[PDB]
Design a protein around this ligand. Structure first.
Ligand code: MOO
Length: 322
């Protein structure tokens, strides 16, 4: 029987981070505890949007907040809960699978959506209201329409199988509306939906789902075979930023996220209890040691880190940022 520590957090350093950061932050935890004897790092892994909402709406206090989408910090935390943030890593949306997945040896970059259209094929993605990988899965599928010249890709895979709706904005931008989390109501024969993307890893391993909308790093961390989606739709390239911006996702609470290159962001909240200790953890993260942890885990780091609001940043961190 799990204790409260075994359920919740599965001196004190409280860190709320993204699900895809579970592997590098686990190695960062062990290294930080090795350098600091009496320090117990307590990590809570959740979708980045709900990780932010714990601080901004639930009144929870964290020392370190790390998101899969850096932009959630200035749009939701700044200026009441945050005065600064730093872009530290990059990632890539892929479609993961294993040997057991149906149509495995036959799926490639030019037919992935056609495979997902099949009634026997089941696929997974996380909750877009809570997780970046969840809303990014919708972004990838919608952008695939204009790339492959097929205006029915998003309708067949998402609109006809969930509670998601779509409207066209005045500038031609597509806007995806995500209803209440319980009213998403996915077609069980076609879609499996979790709160965060990494909980769906177990589903792909057993063959409960055939394909999974997830990051490249997570696929390499688990050893899954994957489909390298075109740079124009996979949110991996800085050059295709103008193309990615033509799709937006509105959450149930009215918050709008925009298609952009996947850029991870970190910050130390304004109401942090151990801000001194948090500084040292972020220093290890943005320093050479943190950089090598990401490279070894298949996640490319932004070296040097790009920060905003440097006049509010602690002095120890200003030597590691741009
Ligand atoms: O915040 Mo995630 O790394 O899209 O579970």
């Amino acid at each position: 029987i799990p204790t409260t520590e075994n359920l919740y957090f599965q001196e004190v350093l409280t860190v709320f981070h993204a699900g895809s950061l579970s592997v590098p932050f686990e190695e960062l935890e062990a290294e930080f505890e090795a350098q600091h004897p009496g320090v117990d790092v307590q990590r809570e892994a959740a979708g980045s949007a709900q990780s932010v909402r714990k601080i901004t709406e639930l009144g929870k206090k964290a020392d370190v907040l790390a998101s899969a989408d850096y932009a959630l910090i200035p749009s939701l935390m700044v200026p009441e809960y945050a005065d600064w943030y730093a872009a530290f890593a990059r990632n890539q949306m892929i479609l993961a699978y294993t040997n057991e997945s149906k149509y495995g040896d036959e799926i490639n970059t030019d037919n992935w959506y056609e495979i997902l259209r099949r009634p026997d094929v089941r696929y997974g993605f996380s909750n877009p209201n809570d997780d970046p990988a969840g809303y990014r899965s919708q972004m990838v599928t919608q952008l695939a329409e204009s790339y492959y010249n097929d205006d029915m890709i998003y309708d067949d895979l998402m609109l006809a199988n969930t509670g998601m709706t779509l409207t066209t904005e005045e500038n031609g931008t597509a806007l995806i509306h995500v209803p209440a989390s319980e009213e998403i109501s996915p077609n069980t024969s076609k879609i499996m939906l979790r709160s965060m993307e990494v909980e769906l890893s177990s589903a792909l391993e057993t063959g409960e789902i055939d394909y999974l909308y997830i990051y490249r790093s997570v696929a390499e961390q688990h050893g899954f075979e994957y489909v390298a989606l075109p740079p124009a739709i996979d949110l991996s390239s800085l050059e295709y930023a103008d193309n990615y911006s033509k799709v937006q996702v509105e959450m149930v609470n009215g918050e709008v996220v925009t298609g952009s290159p996947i850029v991870y962001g970190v910050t130390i909240p304004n109401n942090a209890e151990n801000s001194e200790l948090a500084t040292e953890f972020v220093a290890l993260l943005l320093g050479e040691t943190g950089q090598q942890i990401f490279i070894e885990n298949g996640q490319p780091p932004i070296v040097p880190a790009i920060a905003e609001g440097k006049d509010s940043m602690p002095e120890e961190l200003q030597a590691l940022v741009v």
